[PDB]
Write a protein that binds this ligand. Structure first.
Ligand SMILES: Cc1cc2nc(N)[nH]c2cc1C
Ligand SMILES: Cc1cc2nc(N)[nH]c2cc1C
Length: 285
């Protein structure tokens, strides 16, 4: 019923290749230093996350929403860790198995076509980059409980997610822009990421705390997502003819509206992107 209707907004991987960097990373890049290319910035964002997790050789890293396996490969090469990836995409599953098999290592590498709900194996650390927007508000308590329970006493997790604000969090300016932002968010979670639901930073923090995690000050990636969306927009536009051939004028116009729109609402500070760290009680100092 709902599975069938949402399929209308399926877009071929070929289309995404006409705006993303060569790693096909579909998340906020990290321009530190500011001079980095998009591709360099995507590796920098992976490092930003992994560097927060206190990874030691022989640990197992869980990647929840492991995409094309860029994060897991980087984790194996830099930290000499075992990796388990979760994805719902058959295409990403096959690509991840090949990426991980390519690696010159004796470390265990596993990728699973399943959600976090089905995953209940012990792991040392957890990374999740822009998968959280799909989980749904009713599932946040189960998600943080699962993540707490599968990790050892010194466990750590990062969740990177786009966020909005509740009107109760906003002054007169934000409240007045709330209707326009809410209508744009509805478009994103209907036509770009079907079934999606944006949290707030406050929700991401308070749900982690309720599960027993210590939550330091979240990092805002807002200026980095503005730069990311600018490059994605400029690249898609430079590839207009090829993008329309691969899909349609409708699909091209849809993603230009998405990319230009997100850059606008990030700039107007009605959207944010939070990298939140979750530390278990026994986490190393
Ligand atoms: C996966 C996802 C990414 C997003 N990026 C922005 N700006 N909104 C979003 C919503 C969802 C569901
Ligand atoms: C390309 C495009 C897609 C849309 N989807 C909704 N709901 N409004 C829209 C407006 C435009 C211009």
């Amino acid at each position: 019923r709902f599975e069938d209707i949402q399929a209308h907004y399926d877009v071929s991987d070929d289309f995404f290749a006409l705006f993303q960097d060569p790693t096909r990373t579909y998340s906020c890049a990290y321009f530190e230093p500011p001079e980095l290319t998009l591709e360099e910035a995507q590796y920098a964002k992976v490092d930003l996350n992994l560097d927060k997790l206190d990874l030691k050789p022989g640990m197992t890293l869980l990647d929840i929403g492991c995409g094309w396996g860029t994060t897991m490969r980087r984790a194996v090469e830099r930290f000499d860790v075992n990796v388990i990836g979760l994805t719902l995409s058959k295409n990403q599953h096959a690509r991840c198995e090949q990426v991980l098999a390519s690696i010159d290592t004796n470390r265990s590498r596993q990728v699973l076509l399943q959600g976090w709900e089905d995953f209940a194996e012990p792991v040392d650390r957890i990374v999740s980059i822009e998968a959280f927007e799909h989980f749904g508000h009713e599932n946040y308590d189960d998600f943080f409980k699962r993540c707490f329970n599968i990790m050892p006493a010194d466990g750590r997790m990062t969740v990177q997610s786009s966020v909005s604000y509740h009107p109760y969090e906003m002054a007169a300016r934000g409240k007045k822009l709330s209707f326009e932002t809410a209508r744009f968010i509805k478009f994103i979670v209907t036509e770009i990421f079907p079934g999606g639901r944006l949290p707030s930073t406050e929700m991401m923090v308070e749900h982690g705390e309720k599960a027993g995690f210590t939550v330091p000050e979240p990092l805002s990636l807002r200026p980095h997502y503005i730069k990311t969306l600018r490059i994605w927009g400029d690249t898609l536009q430079s590839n207009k003819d090829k993008a329309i051939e691969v899909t349609s004028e409708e699909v091209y116009n849809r993603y230009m509206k998405y990319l230009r729109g997100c850059e606008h609402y990030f700039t107007d500070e009605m959207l944010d992107c939070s990298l939140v760290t979750y530390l278990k009680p026994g986490a190393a100092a």
